[PDB]
Symmetry: C5
Subunit: 391 residues, 5 copies
């Protein structure tokens, strides 16, 4: 003749009358507090300006109608009832691309003082700002908010329930060996108002996401230095052979088709410009001026219709090397004619030989100038790595 | 012995009887007003003729059955009740590709005068018209409507509640650094009727979306001028060497394979034709006539079976340069035979030399003509940029 | 003391008892009529044999239990009640790949005679037959049906409510500047029966969809004629130079890699064969026989181990051109030896010159034959365009 | 004063009490019968080991609580009631990748004997085994089951209601001109038990799916024979010209890049190996040995540092062709010196000519051997087609 | 006058009062046990750090309110009631990317002792850790948990109901011929607590997934050895011909474009580095040094401006081969001049011949050194296969 714990349950849930806002006085606003912790973060998308994450969520509010004494009710401090019976205030996240899918988990906590608690899992894919001005080391300053969509300041109040330093520095749960890592989150309470006499409660959390370069750094540094060092190899073969310019245009077309297929994949943005992309344009212009001096050296060496060398080429090159390091009479007539033809042919051959020599000398000089250019390239890389190492 | 605010709630919600249209007289139509503001806009698709956006939505109507005095009911002006109990008129958006996903947020406002309000978030992906006749600077004149699907003029009335200038010029909420930016929206109220005596209420909002070129302008202007300037480099090597035409067909195949892989990605439409695409066809025809004059210069220079030069080539070129800038007798017989063979060989060599010279002269002339063509290309680009800068 | 319009509502909805089929006599079948209009059509898929569309839907039936007089009930002819209370017969569409998503719009019309109406939006993505035998101008004869899934002939009757000519010719709502355009729809009422004594009602609508070629016609006609006309350019350079066959295999590999990447995209079918695809195979075989005659002309000209020309080559070519357009004695001995060597060398040179000449003559002849082949190609294109212009 | 047909309806549905298993005796198991017919089959996926289909489904069971006489109840044999009120046993399909989407169609049949029927449409995408050992002609032996997930043998009994031959041979509904065609389905009733005293009812249907080669057979046979016959063309040009090996490596790289891009698309599997894929490896090795003999013939012909021919090359080749088909004395001294130099040069030229001749002879022989290899290739193709034609 | 089995059903379900936690004493926690078996596993994704699987799930708990005697209640031991009426505790899986879709199957078991059972199918796609340090043979140590989200230790208790060895070794159901195979699962019960006095129950199952290499092993080993053995073929042609370096850069560009398109597909990770990828970089550097020695041999052989050979090249090579294996006077003057010119020309020709000889000797030596390098490559492959065969 003694009922179970459900006696208190149907004593409370007899006339709860959900759908009305539970207050003793309507002027006093109820308080629902916010708390968010980030369990994990999934992949982002730079095309859609969007990112995915999985955070654990918890909140509580004062229900104000559930009052019972701990004595003579079999010492009951807390119990479990479904969330469909209890009035639940709406805490809505903005800038979402779709509604977050989640299990129902229809259970909430209660307390004898009237405080009710709700622990729910909710994940969100949301669109916010991001920059790619430094793509290996980006700040990724995104924001996600928790506001009341339908209600005002005067009825719903949002607090923290924790110290802001404890929320700011919390690394209890986070999955490692991922591409992205957070260091801190930042709570902020600002009031939101579009027009006069309509101010709504808003709680904003700022996340800072650090991407770690381990794999894409090697995958970006390897093919550029690879094709540059095979270009350094491919300068060495002599220029009067015609396969050098075909080699270099083969290398140029290969670097072009590789540069097109890789620039759309990893910095896949519509508006932002990476710092590495202009560096690629500098590499393209450097390959272009290399092709231009190759064309010039190929043009400078030829064997047909070459005249005498100008004396300013001869005077400068010798200064460059020192700072660098009847049956008897008729037959004689025709034999002199044959000698004249052979002498003209050998004279043309010696002129072509001298043009080949001065072309070889200028080719060696311009190769050493390009080596100094590669040294400046390496100094730029070392300075960039030293700045990012100092941080 | 004094109840809470729920006394007014179950005084109102005792016999509300949802599902019937609440009027005192059925001839008088109720008024539901429209209001829309655009928080953000996501990406579009040119293939599916569709676009995505996220707008904040709000509306109100007269419920006509909820009447209570502010005096003696504890000064209650407004309160919150779920939207499932209240009759909600259907405001449906057309030309949608799927139903818009959204949270339920089951709460509405009421007032003592009978006016009820509903604030709901709804996003929409909808299919409308777009043109690509100017792809960097497009108008993007799309339309999205708010009509009553099931009801008529005579029962549901749609108004604005705001000035049309205030709706037309409103930039309170919009996310920056995106690819698309709106400048104004345009409200319009037109009646919709398919047959006789059936007119339905329709409210149409016209959006104008301006795309900003920052990244794709550089990404479209850089490779075309890049391959044209490396072609300008690649004209310089002499034509009698056979690697020039191989260089040019390598450049042509590279430009072709690049032009195919990039034309399907960014102007990804099935019907519309961009203005930049015909410009690409002009570039292809210009590269074709460059390849044609290259083939002509390669054909014009040869060393085997070349006859005497025609005098119209010789007369025109000298005018072009000035406006441009027994044991004793038998041995003599065989020696004369050897002289005859050597003289014939040297005569053929001199003829081939003259053909090489006139080919070189015509090659220089046609190169300068192509330089004038590049100047006309640049004048066209400067005129186009000047028109788009004047706007 | 006078109630509102809800008095008639709860006079009707007191004991409606949904879920039972409303008839006075069970032998008499109720009639639900069909009507469909096509607002818009979205993209199709040739891979999945499927297509998407958005049609406006409407239907009505006799509810037979709602009877009230217009007099003394405040002149009420029609009113609105939710569709969840009213028995709704199932009109199901077949050959669907998934359930169509749509808003609930839970409202229906009633009338005092008992006729109830329901206006609902429903879109459908459905799988049906299509052919690509003429891919620019296809018929696209698809079918979509409206049958009763669960009920029979004897209980549910399907009529039209409109003239079949008015349904057949109706262009009130359709979006323009799309890839697809319909000209007519065709209603048809056929009985459906799998076994004996089980006949079900079926209403079938046949849609005919005309695709308009504006963009893909240019995008398909431009690169083929482009590579053919650059081949016409590339025949001109002399064949004894070795870069001609490298040019032609470069063009052949480029046309092959372009033909592979474009044939999988636009005619993306698993079974059907387009008429344009065999035309591409004819183009490939024509490029192959061009490469074959190029290889033959390259083989026919050589300078080492060439014998005397056969007289059938010499007799045919001269007919082709006319219809086309001691110290004194020993030194003499060794000098005669040197003369013998030089005479042998010049004889071999003259033989190689004659082989070069006859190769050049045959090359010009075969080039003119290929020009006649291009004329036959153009006649085929003009005949095809004339047939499709006559229609 | 005479009610409608709903009198029998609320006589039956007063105390039906859904959720309890309807039996008069709990020891007697109720029988729910199975029946499945395949309306259509959609595409499959070889990567995800999964396939899609659309089957029509029907089943019935004995409800045992609905008993009414046909007399004095207005001759009612059958009527329609919603499926939410009637107890529905769970018939669940296994190896599904997601829950099948379907309309609710909430209506079932009843009968006066107590037999209730349910006709529902359900489509399924399910993962099962498949093999690609013969990819044009595969068996595709997949299985799909209908078991009771929650209940046992002792309460739910599964029968057929039709002859197994009539289920095995049924072609009433199937869409033609698709890639896949079934010839028969196979019913099988096996008991399923994991541990002792827990046996569950399982009904398994085995489907056999025949793929028809019309388009991909041509699309697979055309490019291989295409590149082989253009290789047959490309053997013909002389080997001492250097463009032959460049031609052949161009063809080899083109065939390699085509073979990579096509082998990942159509036989897109992770584990299974097709028979056509090893055939492609045989083609690659054949192209490799062709490139190897090409390199050997290019190496065998050279003009610098060639010694005398070995006599085993000279003896074998002549057997191969027959079975195949003071001022007076000093000037004489220097003239003899010039004769010595010219004689040495002509001797070296004749040696190089003989090496060119024997290289040409061996090239013709190896070309005819490769022609015999192409004949063996064709015999293999004819034998394969003859076996698949005999079947 | 004797009711059916539903008498016990509405004797039990009269006042069950769902939503309250059923206990006689609130201090005593109820026990819900866990059990999981893996029916099948679908594909994984290395990009999203996620994997898909389909497991069969079962659990039971003590309901504590359903008590009835087997005698006089018609011998009823167990019966079936819907799961919506019975209180169901929440067992939630973490690190999920979306909610798992599943049928409702709303039926549970009961027993006369009070024990209720629930058999439900649930599949899950979840994100966990994985490594690619050995991509053909990986451990794939993933974890999936079963915790109570809302409740504590003090109210919900999780046990096993089976021996841990029987759970660890269970291969009753698993689909074969897949890419992945499990060998064991590992249960573990650890307590989960974020702050003080809040400890929650957690049950963790560790799965170990072994991937089998059959197809991708051949698909990865075949093209690398293929291009290396065609490089071994392509070393053989003489280096003074210019097509060798064009051949090798054609092979290098083909291997580069193949290496780029295949490295993004199969090891598609953002952070992890495979062991095969560095092996590919070693192959690229080996091809680079092969191209470098090819460029060196091409540079070493030339015919213009070659001086006398240095004696250290001549002394080392002869040691390398042995360990390896008036009208009368004027005409005489001009004839001596012609002899001087011919002697100079022949001297230059002999010097160029000697340079060609020493280049050929060094080329053969470096080819044999590269053959020893290929032997070291093969020894590395054999050692790797021997280690993975020993395991
Ligand atoms: C599209 O196909 C349907 C059938 O697939 C055609 O319908 C036929 O129409 C003729 C005359 O209207 C009837 O005699 C046939 O019985 C119909 N066939 C069937 C199976 O019902 C329809 O005519 C086709 N449309 C066009 C434009 O040709
Ligand atoms: N802060 C809740 C969003 C919000 C503020 N003002 C609003 C006005 C209209 C609307 O739909 C939404 C809002
Ligand atoms: N304005 C609501 C659309 C509309 C107007 N007339 C209609 C007729 C039928 C239908 O399904 C829809 C409509
Ligand atoms: N409206 C066609 C319904 C239909 C006809 N025969 C059928 C057989 C089985 C089934 O589930 C459904 C059907
Ligand atoms: N035959 C229904 C599947 C099945 C058999 N035994 C089972 C045990 C547990 C479970 O969840 C499912 C099953
Ligand atoms: N083990 C249940 C998850 C859990 C433990 N502590 C929590 C705190 C907050 C929260 O949202 C979730 C949790």
């Amino acid at each position: 003749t003694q009922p179970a714990l459900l006696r208190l349950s149907d004593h409370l849930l007899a006339n709860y009358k959900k759908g009305v806002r539970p207050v003793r006085d309507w002027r006093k606003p109820t308080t629902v507090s916010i708390d968010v912790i980030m369990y994990a973060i999934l992949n982002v998308d730079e095309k859609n300006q969007v990112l995915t994450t999985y955070i654990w969520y918890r909140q509580y509010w004062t229900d104000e109608f559930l009052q019972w004494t701990p004595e003579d009710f079999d010492n009951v401090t807390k119990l479990s009832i479904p969330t469909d019976s209890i009035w639940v205030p709406d805490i809505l996240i903005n800038e979402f691309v779709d509604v977050g899918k989640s299990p129902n988990i229809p259970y909430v906590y209660v307390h004898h003082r009237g405080e009710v608690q709700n622990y729910k899992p909710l994940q969100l894919v949301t669109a916010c700002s991001l920059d790619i001005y430094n793509f290996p080391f980006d700040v990724q300053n995104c924001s996600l908010t928790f506001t009341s969509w339908l209600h005002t300041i005067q009825d719903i109040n949002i607090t923290l329930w924790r110290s802001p330093e404890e929320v700011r520095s919390d690394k209890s749960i986070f999955i490692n060996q991922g591409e992205w890592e957070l260091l801190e989150v930042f709570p902020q309470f600002k009031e939101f108002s579009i027009d006069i006499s309509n101010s709504y409660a808003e709680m904003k959390f700022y996340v800072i996401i650090r991407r770690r370069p381990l794999f894409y750094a090697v995958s970006l540094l390897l093919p550029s230095i690879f094709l540059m060092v095979v270009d350094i190899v491919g300068f060495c073969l002599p220029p009067d052979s015609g396969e050098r310019v075909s080699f270099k245009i083969t290398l140029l077309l290969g670097y072009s088709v590789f540069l097109i297929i890789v620039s759309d994949t990893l910095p896949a943005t519509a508006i932002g410009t990476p710092l590495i992309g202009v560096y690629f344009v500098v590499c393209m212009a450097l390959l272009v001026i290399s092709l231009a001096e190759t064309i010039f050296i190929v043009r400078l060496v030829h064997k047909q219709d070459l005249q005498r060398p100008v004396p300013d080429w001869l005077r400068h090159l010798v200064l460059d090397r020192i700072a660098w390091i009847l049956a008897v009479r008729g037959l004689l007539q025709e034999l002199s004619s044959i000698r004249h033809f052979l002498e003209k042919r050998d004279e043309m051959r010696e002129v072509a030989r001298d043009w080949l020599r001065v072309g070889y000398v200028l080719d060696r000089l311009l190769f050493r100038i390009y080596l100094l250019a590669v040294l400046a390239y390496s100094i730029t890389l070392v300075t960039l790595w030293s700045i990012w190492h100092y941080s």
